[PDB]
Amino acid sequence: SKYMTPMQQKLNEVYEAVKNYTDKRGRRLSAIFLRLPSRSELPDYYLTIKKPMDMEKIRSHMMANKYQDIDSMVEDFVMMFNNACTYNEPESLIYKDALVLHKVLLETRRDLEGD
Ligand SMILES: [Cl-]
């Protein structure tokens, strides 16, 4: 029950790498990516963004064993970061953090390449 398969562990490690990333100043960038606002808190968002995505949705999908490989998980993270960069202006913190976390994501995948 509690022992993950290698693929489950890899998925978890990728997810945790993005979640736990702290920069050189101690700032945990993922805090604002965990959960989107509701449709009634920010309707404009859901009019603008075709496929809403946040880390909780990612985590839920992973916990359900719905990701069959790492690339499928990466695709959802990419969607999330691209949505943040579509809704928000390039000057904004959310846009900038999405770029940093995208780099964390890809470096992590590359680092785990051989497992
Ligand atoms: Cl980095």
Author numbering: 620 to 734
What is written in the article reporting this PDB entry?
Bromodomains (BRDs) are protein interaction modules that specifically recognize ε-N-lysine acetylation motifs, a key event in the reading process of epigenetic marks. The 61 BRDs in the human genome cluster into eight families based on structure/sequence similarity. Despite large sequence variations, all BRD modules share a conserved fold that comprises a left-handed bundle of four α helices (αZ, αA, αB, αC), linked by loop regions of variable length (ZA and BC loops), which line the Kac binding site and determine binding specificity. The four helices form a deep cavity that is extended by the two loop regions (ZA and BC loops), creating a largely hydrophobic Kac binding pocket.
BRDs are evolutionarily conserved and present in diverse nuclear proteins comprising HATs (GCN5, PCAF), ATP-dependent chromatin-remodeling complexes (BAZ1B), helicases (SMARCA), methyltransferases (MLL, ASH1L), transcriptional coactivators (TRIM/TIF1, TAFs) transcriptional mediators (TAF1), nuclear-scaffolding proteins (PB1), and the BET family (Muller et al., 2011). The most notable structural difference within the BRD core fold is a hairpin insertion located between helix αZ and the ZA loop that is present in all family VIII members. The proximity to the Kac binding site suggests that this insert may play a role in recruitment of acetylated binding partners. The nuclear body protein SP140 as well as the related protein LOC93349 and PCAF showed nonspecific binding to most peptides. In contrast, the second, fourth, fifth, and sixth BRD of PB1, MLL, and TRIM28 interacted with only a few histone Kac peptides.
